[PDB]
Design a protein around this ligand. Sequence first.
Ligand SMILES: OC[C@H]1O[C@@H](O)[C@H](O)[C@@H](O)[C@@H]1O
Length: 372
Amino acid sequence: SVNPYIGRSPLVIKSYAEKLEETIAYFEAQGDELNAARTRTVQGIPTFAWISDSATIDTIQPLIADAVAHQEASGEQVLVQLVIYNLPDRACAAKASDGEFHLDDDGANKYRAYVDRIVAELSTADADKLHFSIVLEPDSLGNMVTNMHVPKCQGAATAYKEGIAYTIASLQKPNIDLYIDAAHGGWLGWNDNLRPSAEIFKETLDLARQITPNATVRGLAINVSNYNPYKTRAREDYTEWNNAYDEWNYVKTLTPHLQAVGFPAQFIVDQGRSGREGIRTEWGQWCNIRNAGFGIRPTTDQAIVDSANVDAIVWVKPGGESDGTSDVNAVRFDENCRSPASHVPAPEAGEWFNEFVVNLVINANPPLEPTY
Ligand SMILES: OC[C@H]1O[C@@H](O)[C@H](O)[C@@H](O)[C@@H]1O
């Protein structure tokens, strides 16, 4: 097992760069050339492509063809970053991100078939030429640690573990590295959550190993779709008593608990919306947090990373894609999307939220260098 980020160039997602044209246009219409040019810089920053429904499976081969073309032109070894995000009864403790599969409508079997489709796409001759970094199921197993009081979560616990296990077991290839989602310091970093978190990650890996002998993963992904700083420049009161008060400290805090259960303690850390601290009044505010800024750009530089346990800082959640609708009539309306810290109005989860990414650019830290 080696750090897949070393010696590779993570792929820029063209479809995301294209959505940013709307942001560029907004800045140009305001006569704001600096921020338009900064948005152009963002178009060239690698992000993760989310396979958040069955239809999106159809983007994988075009992405692979694009990556193979770029690899052969540039001579760089490309790293394609994907998220698998379609568990049945998905995101059980909120409403914002409910998906297409439901346990009461053959969802477990449908999830398996969805995974099988992805595996086939990742098994082509072109796929063989590439390497993949894959985050598995954000906002899943953390719910088994803290949210079992929520009926949907209690009902989905087995399906989450078995689903992720099937995914792990199905993606054992020399050119794929897997990272299981591990929430963020404000959720699973509290002292009493550390051991059961480590245990459920190991339980899930062991289930995978019952399907595919010797199945492994690279490690964990943390802070996916959240806002926590890597290293805080002002510790917030809501983090007191939690040793995982920034994501660098979450890594330090969780690592020995992973080691205790024989789970690999290697991490990738989302910093795509982490540039601006101090934008929340409570740690559990997650939905479209107003004035979020783009954070530390994707990097493996140990001068910044400062941890042998961290493979890379990455951008997993693509800034500008909504966390959830603020429309109170919507089936997927979640009250968290109208928290005192939320940017309202906001469109459905995953849909483009131009005003939000306008603010991500303005609030970026370090500031974005313009590409004029
Ligand atoms: O933006 C990345 C993903 O974020 C999730 O919160 C949404 O539910 C998905 O629709 C989206 O693809």
